[PDB]
Symmetry: D3
Subunit: 245 residues, 6 copies
C-alpha cells in the first residue's frame, strides 16, 4: 500500500490496519479525491486477509477538519448540476454506507481536530478513542450551513438530545474528556497513550471470531431501529446466519 | 405587547423575546384560556422581526404547575363531549405542535415549579436552563392519572429509559441539578444567575443566521426518527432548502 | 399455593410483594427449557393472583442468572427434530419479554449477583432494576463464538448508550453494579446488604399507586419511544382515556 | 354570508362545505386556506353538523393551489411569511381534516388537480362524478407535488399507477379514479348528490364517538406494527367506551 | 388421538393437512374465552406434531366465525377481577395472530360461510385464504356501537385498499366472497361445493416445499412490509442464511 | 459505448438509453461480473448528458432469468468467506441501491422471462411495461431457496399481500397481463408493440425538467415510508431543493 493513494496512507501490522487520512497541510479536510480514495481503501481492505481490524486516524495535528470547501466548490462548479449527486454519493459511500456496517471491526482513533463532516465516519466507526487534547466542533452553523450529510444523525445516535442540540445550534467546541462524557466516543486518554490504548483494544477485538463479531456489531446497530417483536425475528436470524457462516 | 393577553406577558429586549406565563396565583397552571393565548403569542412572535430568540418562563415562583385540570374539567363537564377535542387540540397546538419545530430558536428558562403537563413545552423548547432551586415532578400518578398529552414522549426524548420510568411510576419530585444530570435540561444554575446565563446563551443563538439555525435544529429533531439511508435524503434536502430560503 | 410448585423457580409473597426467585443455584440459575416453561406458568399465575401487587425477579444463591443454559438447549435441539428449536426460542421469549415487558403489574429486577448473556432480556423487560455493587454483568456470548441471542442486543439498545453497548457486546468484558447504574442498565446499585431493603421500599411506593393507572403510565412510556410526537398525541390520550375507563 | 371563499349549507345533519371561487375553479388561495381552517373549527363544535361533505361551486372541485395568490402574499413579505402560508394550507387540508372528529366525504363534482389531492384523501370517503377530470399537473409546470399530494397518492393508489400519474402529469377520469382506489365510487354527475347523501345518511346512523374511534383507528393502524396495534387499537376501543 | 380433546375445536389430519375446525356451530363458532384457550393449545400442539405439514382453519356448520362471543366475554369480565379482561384479550391475540401470523407451518383459511368482526384477525394471520362465493363478510361492530377490536382494523389495512377498508369499517355493510377476493381480503372465491377441493389442491402444493424454506419465505415477506429497502437487505439475507442453516 | 462491457450493451437513441442485459445463452442470468458491469453502466450513464431516460431490457428471449446461482456458488465456494459480502453488496448496488433512487427516470421494458432476483431491478425501475407473452415467477422456492436480496420487498411494494404470498409460497408462474393486473408493472402489451409503447412513454418523460422529475419520483418513493407529519417536512424540503437545483 506504500505510495498507493494520494490522500490516504494504510499501514498494516499484526492484523491492525491503520488507515491514515493524509492531507495534513489542510488538516485532513475531506476532498472529493480523498472520498474516492477512501472508497477504494475500504473495498481493498475488506478483501485483504492481513487486515482483521481497521483503525481510522489522521496525519499530523488533525483527525479531520471536515469537508474541503475549496475542493468541493472547485469540482462542483466545474460541472453540470448532476455532478453534485456523484460527489455527495462518494462522500456517503465511504463515510457510512460502507463503514457503518463494515464487515470488519473499526475503531476511530481521534488524535486531534475533529470538525463538521468528520462526525459521520467518527460514528460509523464501531468504537472510538480520542486524545484529551483533541478538539471537536460542529462549526457548520458558524459557516452559515446546517450540518450536511449524516452529521446530525451521527450526533443523534451517540449524544443526548439537549447536548446534541446545544453543540449543533451554538457551534461551540469541546475537548476529548467532554466527548467521552457525552457518549460521542468510548474513552479519552492523553495523546501520549492514545496509540497504545487503541492497540490494546484492537488486539481484544482480534481475539474474536470475525463472522460472530460482525453479526454482533451489525445486529446491535440495526436493532436500535426495530421494535422488540421485529428484533425477535431479526436477531435470531443474525444468530443463525453467524452459525452458518 | 403591553397588556395584550390576560394570562401571558411578552417582553422583548434587544432581540430576545421573554414569553412569561402569568397566572402566578395558580402557579401558571395551563387553562384553556392560557392555551389559546399561547397559540396567539407564538403565531404573533413568529412574524415579528424584533424577536430573534424566544425564552419561555413563568411569573412568580412557578414555571408551570401543569394543566389546570380544574378549569379543564369545568369547561368539559358542563359542555358537549366534543368540546374536549378542541381543548386538547389547543393544548397540543402551542405546547409542541407549533413549539417543537418553531421557526426561531427557543429556550425554556425554568425558574421554579415544573410539573406534569409542563414537560411537553419544556422539551419542545430547543434548549433549557433551570434554577437549582426548581422542582420537577410527574405527580400525575399520585392523582390517579397517567401522564397526559405528550409528557411521556418529552421524557422519552431527553431522559434515559430507567430514569424516565422511575419518575413516571413513582411520581417522585426532583430538583434542577438532577434534571440537568438526567438530561431533561441542558444546565442548572443558581436562581440568582438564571437570567444572566439564559441571556448569554440567547445572545449566542441570536447571532446565527436564523434560516440556517432553523434547518439545523429541525433537521436534528427529525433525523432521530429516520434511518441513516432516509436521512441521507432528508438532511441533504434540508441543507439545500436552507440555501434556497437563506437567499 | 406456591410451596414446592415448580422445580426451577420459587415464589414467595408477602405484603403485596411477590418475590420470583430463579432457583437452579448449582447452575447459577441458567435458564433451561424447563425453567422457561415454568416461568411462563409463574407469570400467568401471578397475573391473576390478588395477593400479588408488584413482582420482584431475583436469583437463589450467588447468581441472578448466568444466562441461557446452552448445554441443555443444544442437548435437546441436537436430539430432537428441527422444529423443537422453534418451541424452545418461543418459550424463552414468552416469559423473558413478551409477557414481562408489558406485564399488567409493576416489575422490579433485583440483581443480587451474576447477570450474563440471556439474563439481559428479562432484566430490561422488568420496569425498574436495582442491583448489588457486587453483581457482575457481562455479555460473554462473543467469547463463546455466538452473537447475543434472543432480545439481549435490544435490551442494551433501550437502556445503555450506543458506544458503551457496542464496547461490551464486541469485547465481552465484564462490569460491576456501579458501572451498570452509571450506564443506565439499572436504576441504582447499592451494597448487597442493602439490596433487599431498597427494593422493598421501591416496591411499597409502587403499591401505593392505582394499578390500572400505573399500568397505563408504564406501558404508555415503553410504547411512546417507538412512536412520533404526532402518533403519540393519539396513542397517549387513548391510554389516558382507557385508564379513566378501567377505573 | 360568513366567508369570502367558502359556503356552508347544512341540511338534516349533512354539512355541505362548498369551495366557492368558481371563477378561478376554486383554486386554493391563502385566503381560502385561512377561511377553511375557520370552517372546520366552527363545524366541529356545531351540533347541527353530523357529517361533512366537501365539494366545489361551479364546474370544479378544485384546480389546486392558486399560484398567483400564493406568490402575491409571499412576494409581499419576508421569508418567514412562507412558513405561515404553508402551515395554513396544511392545517385545513389534512392536519385538521385527516383525523377530523366527524365523518367526511369528498364529493368530487369536477376538476380535481394538484394540491386538491391532499384534502381529497384526508376526507374519509370520496365519491366522484364520471365526468370529473383528475390530474397531477405539477410536473408539467416544473414543480414536484407540493404539500401532501404524494402521500395522498401513496395512501390510496398503487405504486406503479401513482408514479405513472406523478411522472407524466396525464389526466384521468372518474371511472379511472375509482378503479385505482383514489375514490370509493364514480357515478354520473346527475346522480352524484343523491348517492353522496345516501352514504352520508348511513354514516349519520352510527354513534359519532364510535365512528370516530373506528375511522381514526384505521388510519393510524396503517402506520403501526401488529404488536403496536394490539396496544393502540384496544386503547381506541376503551376510549370509545368511555366517551360513550 | 385429537378425537374429543377440545370442547370448542376439532382437529383432523389428512396425510399432512391438519384441518382445524372451530366447533360451536350453534353459536356460528363465536370465539369465547374457552375457545381462545383451546386454540392456543391446538396451535402449540400442531406446531410440534410431525404428522402436520399445513394447517387449514375452517368452521363447523354454516359459519366460519361470527366473531367474538360478546355475551360470554361480557359475562366473564363482569364476574371476574378487573385484570381478567387483560388475560382474555391476551389469549385472544395469542392464537389469532401472535402465534398464527408468523406460524412455523403454512396456514390457509378455508372460509366456508359467515366471517364477521373479530374473525378478520385470524383470517389475515393465516398465510393464504380461499372462501366460498356464498360466504358473507362484515365488520358490523360499528352497528352495535363498537369500533373494530383486537387487530381487525390492521388485518383490513394489510389486505384491503384504504378507501374500501374505510367504507366497510365505517358503514358496517356486508359483502360476499367474490367481492372479498376482488378486494384482496382472500386469494380466491369459489362455489362452496368446490371449496374443500380447491383448498386441498393448494395445501398439497405447499406440502411439496421444504418446510424450513417455506417458513423463511412467508415470514420474510410479512416482515419486509414493515422495513425499509436498506433494512431489508440485512434482514432478508439473514432469513436466507438462516434457512440454509436449518435446512 | 459499443463493445465496452462483456455482459451488458448500451444503445442511446434520441435521449433514450437502452440498457441491455446481454447473456442471452443464459437467459441474462445475473453473474458477479454482470453486477460489476451494471454498476459501471449506471454510474457512467448518470453523468452522460446524452442519456435522459434509461430503459432496462434483455437480449434474446428473456428479460432476466434471475441470479446466476451456478456462478455465484462457484465463486463463493472458491473465494474467502468475506467474498460473499462483496458479491451480495455489488448485486444490491446496481439492482436497487443506485437504481431505485436513480437521478434519471427509468423504465423496465420486460420482453420475456423475468424470474427470482430479476424482481428487484424490475421494481427499482420507476415504471415498467411488459409483453403479454412474458412469463414471471418466483420459482426460488421450488429449488429450496427463499427469495434472496430485495425480491420480497419489490413484491410487497407493488403487489397485494395475498397475491404476493401466493406466488412466493407456491412458486407458480404468471404472464404479462396478470403482472399488470396485480400491479407489478404499469401495462402489458403484445411483444410486437412493446418497444413502440415504451418509447412513447420515455418521450413523455424526456419532456419534463430532469431535476423536477427527480424530486417528484424520489419524493413519492420516500413518502411511502414516512407519516403525514414527517412528510410535511420532507416533501416541502424536496420541493425547495428542486427549486434550488433547477
Amino acid at each position: 500500500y506504500e505510495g498507493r493513494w494520494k490522500t490516504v496512507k494504510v499501514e498494516i501490522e499484526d492484523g491492525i490496519a491503520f488507515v491514515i487520512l493524509n492531507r495534513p497541510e489542510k488538516r485532513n479536510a475531506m476532498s472529493p479525491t480523498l472520498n474516492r480514495e477512501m472508497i477504494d481503501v475500504l473495498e481493498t481492505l475488506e478483501q485483504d486477509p492481513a487486515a482483521g481490524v481497521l483503525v481510522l486516524t489522521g496525519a499530523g495535528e488533525a483527525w479531520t477538519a471536515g469537508m474541503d470547501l475549496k475542493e468541493y466548490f472547485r469540482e462542483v462548479d466545474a460541472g453540470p448540476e448532476i455532478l453534485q449527486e456523484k460527489i455527495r454519493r462518494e462522500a456517503s459511500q465511504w463515510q457510512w454506507k460502507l463503514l457503518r456496517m463494515y464487515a470488519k471491526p473499526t475503531i476511530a482513533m481521534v488524535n486531534g481536530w475533529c470538525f463538521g463532516g468528520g462526525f459521520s465516519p467518527l460514528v460509523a466507526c464501531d468504537l472510538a478513542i480520542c486524545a484529551d487534547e483533541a478538539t471537536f466542533g460542529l462549526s457548520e452553523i458558524n459557516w452559515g450551513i446546517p450540518p450536511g450529510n449524516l452529521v446530525s444523525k451521527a450526533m443523534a445516535d451517540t449524544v443526548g438530545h439537549r447536548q446534541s442540540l446545544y453543540y449543533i445550534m451554538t457551534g461551540k467546541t469541546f475537548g476529548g474528556q467532554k466527548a467521552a462524557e457525552m457518549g460521542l466516543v468510548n474513552e479519552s486518554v492523553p495523546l501520549a497513550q492514545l496509540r497504545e490504548v487503541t492497540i490494546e483494544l484492537a488486539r481484544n477485538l482480534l481475539e474474536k471470531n470475525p463472522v460472530v463479531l460482525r453479526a454482533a456489531k451489525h445486529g446491535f446497530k440495526r436493532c436500535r431501529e426495530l421494535t422488540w417483536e421485529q428484533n425477535e425475528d431479526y436477531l435470531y436470524a443474525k444468530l443463525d446466519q453467524s452459525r452458518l457462516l
